[PDB]
Amino acid sequence: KAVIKNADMSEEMQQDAVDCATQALEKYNIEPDIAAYIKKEFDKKYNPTWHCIVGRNFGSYVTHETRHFIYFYLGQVAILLFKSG
Amino acid sequence: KAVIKNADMSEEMQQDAVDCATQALEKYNIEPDIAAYIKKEFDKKYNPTWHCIVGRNFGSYVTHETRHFIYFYLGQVAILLFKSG
Numbered sequence: 340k341a342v343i344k345n346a347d348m349s350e351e352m353q354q355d356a357v358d359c360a361t362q363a364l365e366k367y368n369i370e371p372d373i374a375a376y377i378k379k380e381f382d383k384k385y386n387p388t389w390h391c392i393v394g395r396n397f398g399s400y401v402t403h404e405t406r407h408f409i410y411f412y413l414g415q416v417a418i419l420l421f422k423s424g
Numbered sequence: 425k426a427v428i429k430n431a432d433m434s435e436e437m438q439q440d441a442v443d444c445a446t447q448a449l450e451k452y453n454i455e456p457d458i459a460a461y462i463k464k465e466f467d468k469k470y471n472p473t474w475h476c477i478v479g480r481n482f483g484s485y486v487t488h489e490t491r492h493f494i495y496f497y498l499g500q501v502a503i504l505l506f507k508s509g
Binding site for chain 1: 454455456457458459460462463464472473474475476477478479480481482483484485486487504508509
């Protein structure tokens, strides 16, 4: 179950973040490995520098670049994915 | 209980991160509020731009600036605090 909590990026790029994180979860179970996959994909497909956080329990306060921020769940796993401002 | 998992910052600044996160935990229970406190303090005391993640369960893959990265626990709460490279 995909739930977008907070986004500041295109509806398209959001769907890509979702699809990429889904792929990550199917391959890996370790959270930094899940985070690595998403991070690297976005650096590839949207240019560096992206950062990624994956976990069942976290909160954050980061400074992001406009249109380059998403925070979402897939089931019980939350994913934060952004470029720094 | 303070446990440094991964640091790339001075032994001094590490101790400050620890002390600041401790203060945060005593005032706030909500993870983004805990993260806000730490973030803002470091932007104040070490210059912007810092980012902070606080949670009981997460992993990450981020790109950090040399000497500006710490990942640590205080009890069951893990704290990630860094400047982007």
